[PDB]
């Protein structure tokens, strides 16, 4: 029993972090095969960040403008190119700890684990959801850029995020592993802000199913609702609308619990209107939207308590 925010074992991503130094700037890079990926602003200086031209700044560097080290081993750079907001540094050794992997663009609402790193050295790990406004509530300090986010399926590592910066509200923005930002953000030291966020409905529901799979049913009711009447309520409360596709996704969890999705929504609609009356669900006093339905199936059991 139990239910926690749970990160993926980070042993495989750890064997791929290195330190990348250009000029006076140091950050983290990701060493897969014979390529080290890192944010391109490693070639920036504090003055440059305000209004940088990357193209211009990079033609001004050579291979040996970049220092790459793993452990105490200096890796030699023998090629470089800019991809979107990232730099691809070809080095003279292939990572022998390179795992099976791929690069995915994560969608809003999906989750991943983040291996926070400093100076190519992994400090810690936690799990965060990509928000609807394309930010994540991470915990990062200066020197954390190039830290990465990923899932692991089977033996494969799906890299979906490299950290590039922090917004004024203290949330984080970054790119997939092709350098294309998540959200309307750019790697410049200029006024930039998170858009309004909303609560991930599909997840709140997946989580209410977890409560039941964990055998707690207190927040259910006799009612049902139409999708459309659910949504007038979703909107009032700054929840994403539910769609028929999200209803199909929740069916397996509906099947394991015997609670109809639209029935569950009525549960939720009631929770939204009446509060939780000082009670907890899965030991939270709040409605939790940072667990996907895939997170619930992985963590929960195949058998419901009762």
């Amino acid at each position: 029993s139990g239910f926690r925010k749970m990160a993926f074992p980070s042993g495989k991503v750890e064997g791929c972090m290195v330190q990348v130094t250009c000029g006076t700037t140091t950050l983290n890079g990701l060493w897969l095969d014979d390529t080290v990926y890192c944010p391109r602003h490693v070639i920036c200086t504090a003055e440059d960040m305000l209004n940088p031209n990357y193209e211009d700044l990079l033609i001004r560097k050579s291979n040996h403008s970049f220092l790459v080290q793993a452990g105490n081993v200096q890796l030699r750079v023998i090629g470089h190119s800019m991809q979107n907001c990232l730099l691809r540094l070809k080095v003279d050794t292939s990572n022998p700890k390179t795992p099976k992997y791929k690069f995915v663009r994560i969608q809003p609402g999906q989750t991943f684990s983040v291996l926070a790193c400093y100076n190519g050295s992994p400090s810690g790990v936690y799990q965060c959801a990509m928000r609807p406004n394309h930010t994540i509530k991470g915990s990062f300090l200066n020197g954390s850029c190039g830290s990465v986010g990923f899932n692991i399926d089977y033996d494969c590592v799906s890299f979906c995020y490299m950290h590039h910066m922090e917004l004024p509200t203290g949330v984080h923005a970054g790119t997939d592993l092709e350098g294309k930002f998540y959200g309307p953000f750019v790697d410049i030291q200029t006024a930039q802000a998170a858009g309004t966020d909303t609560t991930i409905t599909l997840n709140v529901l997946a989580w209410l199913y977890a409560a039941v799979i964990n055998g707690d049913r207190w927040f259910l009711n006799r009612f049902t609702t139409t999708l459309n009447d659910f949504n007038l309520v979703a909107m009032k409360y700054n929840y994403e609308p539910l769609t028929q596709d999200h209803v199909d996704i929740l069916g397996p969890l509906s099947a394991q619990t015997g609670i109809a999705v639209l029935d569950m929504c009525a549960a939720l609609k009631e929770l939204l209107q009446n509060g939780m009356n000082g009670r907890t669900i899965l030991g939270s006093t709040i409605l939790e939207d940072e667990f996907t339905p895939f997170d619930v199936v992985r963590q929960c059991s195949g058998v419901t308590f009762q």
Binding site: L27, H41, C44, C145, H163, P168, Q189
Partner: peptide, 5 residues
């Protein structure tokens, strides 16, 4: 401003 870590 945004801050690039």
């Amino acid at each position: 401003s945004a801050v690039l870590h």
